[PDB]
Structure 1
């Protein structure tokens, strides 16, 4: 009938009618959460006829990998899985298979610039898990391992796969560590406005509102099918970086800081027909994420106004390019602060140069590299970056890390 378009800034929604008068030649590229990048709920298992080919394909991918293939085991595994499939319905992956799965799924994530590190990933097998409390433990083991006291390490903890579709393990949080946002009495908003709805949720589930600007949210976990059990993260586990500029000593007066661990929680790993609706992973921050997005977005901490004022710029004259100047300094503050306190981080430039090297290896190797230009290009200094001037195709392969419908919209309440 029509297409819904949202402005992630003002949150305003629009309905596009004109597209119908289009030509006999409508790129969805700009859209954030398309259905084509999401993998929703269920009620029944994966029909055999589908599950089977996907499975075989996957096993063929895996075994087609290693130098001098293990043809016998290849056939054997195919056979063994085929069998296991017809016998149980679903099937289990050899640990080494999962490792390969997650690495490829990351390798296939079109919106990630860190993919040159695809081969350096740590996998935590939590497939035998069965309780929320047990999830919580694996998660802490994750956070601890990942953090590694500043020398951040990429890792992913894989929880139980999808069975029927009503026995799903799910982390309700956006990412492992994430500050809270509260709509205060004086009409204002303290903390991270992005986590506003979710915060209220934690509150409803009896969470203790610490009412600050940097209150690390609790882990909302749900096992099998059972409701979400709220678990607060141990502060000793949450490493943070206090922001301070290398020349503007007044920058620390802003009382700013940010968590050192970027760990996406709510994504789904699809592989060989199976799907794991819970498998948080982490890489390491890229300056701009914090400096530009987190600190400067209108919908986030929105600091640009005062970082500009305190710098003395003509904040009431757009043409003075103060916003450009301010942001750059916030960026160095972040980079400086992470660098100073020995917490891994990568500036957007060195990041892009490496991604360019990634493609070069990727195309030469397998013949392609799914890339979302809209996402891959840094939020600042776009054309200064090599990736801006790089044409790229955005396509979904398998395995893959799909988005998924926010669990609180589709959940049973016993």
Structure 2
């Protein structure tokens, strides 16, 4: 009938009617959460006719991977998996296949720029987990390992796969560590304005609002389909970096800081027909994420206004290019602060150059590399980065990390 378009800045929604008047051969590339990048809920297990081909294809991919194929084992695995499928409905991946799966799903993540690190990933097997308290412990082990007191390590914690569709393990958080956002009495908003609706959710589940700008949100976990249990993350585990500019000593007076761990929590890993709706992963930060996005977005911390004021820029004249001046410094603050406090971080320039190297390796190796230009090009210095001048193809392969419908929208409350 029509297409819904949203402006993530003002949150304003629009309805596109015009596209109907279009010619022959509409691209939706600009859309944030398209259904094509989302893998939703279920009620019944994966139909056998669908699971089997996917499984067989995955197993052929895995065995067709190493240097000198173990054909007998390949044939044996195919056979054992087929049997296991017709015997239980679903099947279990060996640890080595899961390891391969996670790396490949990352390797196939069109929106990730750090993919040159794809072969360096720690896999935490939490497939035997069965309770919320148990998830929480697995998560803590993850946060601890990943953090490594600054020298961040890429890692992923794979929880139990989806069975019938009503026994899903899900983390209700955007990411492991994430500040809270509250709409204060005086009309304002303190903290991360992006976690507003979620923060309220934690409040309704009995969370203690510490009303601040950097209040690490609680872990909201759901095990085997039972309602979510609220667990607070042990502060000793949550490593942070206090922002401070190497020149403007008044920068630390802003009282800015940010967590060192970028651990996406709400994504689903699909592989060989199977699907893990809970499998938080992490790599390390890239400056612009915090410096530009987190700190400067209108819908986020929105620090630009005063960072410019304190630099003495013509804040009421757009053409003065003050925003470009401010942000650049905020970015250096971040890179410096992290680099100083010995926390692994990467600037967008070096990141872009390493990705270009990755694309080359990828095309020569498997003849391609799924890439989402819109996401790969840094939020600043677009054409200054090599990836801006690189034409790219965006496609979904398998394994793959899909998005999923926010759990609170689709959940039964016992």
TM-score, structure 2 as length reference: 1.00
Match of 2:301 in 1: 301
- The structural deviation recorded for 1:361 is 0.3
- The structural deviation recorded for 1:390 is 0.2
- The structural deviation recorded for 1:24 is 1.2
1:34 and 2:39 matched:
no
2: CA distance, partners of 1:16 / 1:376: 26
- The structural deviation recorded for 1:407 is 0.2
Alpha carbon RMSD of aligned pairs, Å? 0.2
1:314 and 2:314 matched:
yes
2: CA distance, partners of 1:166 / 1:43: 6
2: CA distance, partners of 1:408 / 1:354: 38
1: CA distance, partners of 2:381 / 2:24: 36
- The structural deviation recorded for 1:180 is 0.2
Deviations 1:81-112 (A, max 9, x none): 00000000000000000000000000000000
Match of 1:287 in 2: 287
2: CA distance, partners of 1:368 / 1:206: 49
2: CA distance, partners of 1:25 / 1:293: 34
Deviations 1:41-70 (A, max 9, x none): 000000000000000000000000000000
- The structural deviation recorded for 1:25 is 2.3
2: CA distance, partners of 1:334 / 1:309: 19
2: CA distance, partners of 1:226 / 1:329: 47
- The structural deviation recorded for 1:78 is 0.1
Deviations 1:335-381 (A, max 9, x none): 00000000000000000000000000000000000000000000000
SS at match of 1:97: helix
2: CA distance, partners of 1:127 / 1:363: 33
Identify unmatched segments of 5+ residues in structure 2.
none
Deviations 1:281-309 (A, max 9, x none): 00000000000000000000000000000
2: CA distance, partners of 1:162 / 1:369: 28
1: CA distance, partners of 2:344 / 2:110: 23
SS at match of 1:23: coil
2: CA distance, partners of 1:49 / 1:201: 39
Deviations 1:262-285 (A, max 9, x none): 000000000000000000000000
Match of 1:328 in 2: 328
Deviations 1:91-143 (A, max 9, x none): 00000000000000000000000000000000000000000000000000000
- The structural deviation recorded for 1:413 is 0.2
SS at match of 2:221: strand
2: CA distance, partners of 1:14 / 1:28: 14
1: CA distance, partners of 2:357 / 2:19: 38
SS at match of 1:294: helix
SS at match of 2:176: coil
SS at match of 1:383: helix
Aligned residues: 414
Match of 1:342 in 2: 342
Deviations 1:193-250 (A, max 9, x none): 0000000000000000000000000000000010000000000000000000000000
1: CA distance, partners of 2:67 / 2:242: 47
Match of 2:149 in 1: 149
Deviations 1:170-205 (A, max 9, x none): 000000000000000001000000000000000000
- The structural deviation recorded for 1:402 is 0.1
1: CA distance, partners of 2:41 / 2:385: 39
SS at match of 1:157: strand
